[PDB]
């Protein structure tokens, strides 16, 4: 239970929560905007995963201001969570290499 692994776990949990809330809130923001496609929850959940991973195929996206604000929160949550996982991996590798050198 080192700090970086704990923060990775917390980040994963928070990211899942952000995906669920982002899905629900994107549907709430986008309904009422003619032409909007991000308007049912299953595909909104798929879109939130797309957005958080940055693997944005372009099949779905928000057209409203509040839908795009929701999108930005999902983007930042995903990108920073994955950066935090990378940082935790770096810390683990650094510690293990320090032990391997006997420092």
């Amino acid at each position, epitope marked *: 239970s080192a700090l970086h692994w704990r923060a990775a776990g917390a980040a994963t949990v928070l990211l899942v929560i952000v995906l669920l809330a982002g899905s*629900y809130l994107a*549907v709430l923001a986008e*309904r*009422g905007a*003619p*032409g909007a*496609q991000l*308007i*049912t929850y299953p595909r909104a959940l798929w879109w939130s995963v797309e957005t958080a991973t940055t693997v944005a195929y372009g099949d779905l996206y928000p057209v409203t201001l509040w839908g795009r604000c929701v999108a930005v929160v999902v983007m930042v949550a995903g990108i920073t969570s994955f950066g935090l996982v990378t940082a935790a991996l770096a810390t683990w590798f650094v510690g293990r290499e320090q032990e391997r050198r006997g420092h």
Partner: antibody
Amino acid sequence: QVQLQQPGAELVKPGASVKLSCKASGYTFTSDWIHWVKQRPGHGLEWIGEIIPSYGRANYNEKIQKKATLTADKSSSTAFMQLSSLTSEDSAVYYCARERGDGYFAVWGAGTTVTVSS
Amino acid sequence: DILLTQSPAILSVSPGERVSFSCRASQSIGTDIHWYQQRTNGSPRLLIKYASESISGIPSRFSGSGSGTDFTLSINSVESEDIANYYCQQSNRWPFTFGSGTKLEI
């Protein structure tokens, strides 16, 4: 059990208003949307609007003259549609329908026949 | 706003035959089309969701097909209880819209 309960009929004088109700039973989810659909005698189905009761936000058909105002009471699982200042063009059966946020109307109420007449 | 064209507006068929209702979307909408039956003085009843998915309690004579702009509701072996108006409805873009309906006659 019947999932959506609507009164059978409402008589409204021209110019007056009426509040239709739709009491829901069965499974209730935060993702539930309640929709309202107008059907004039011998005509098709016309979407009026929707409301998400867990948040109270309502959206309306932009193509038609706005005569409805949608509200919901979460404590009694009942959705209301206030139709305001009616003419005979507003005489119709008004259905409510429940959509689980996945785009289709899984269940419909029996419909309230609204007659606008003196 | 997506226009759903149902034509012909009336279909006449002999008992026991296969019948197909047409629904055409003004733009491509994947499989986001749902089909409802409304008998005289009745409420609409969902028959088929997402173009081809069965609904519990609906007779297996009902099926659906198509994707993009062209969709078909089919009844294998029509019988008298199938006399009704049939409506398609799209959920691909806001607002949801309905077709103008096709009447089945036997």
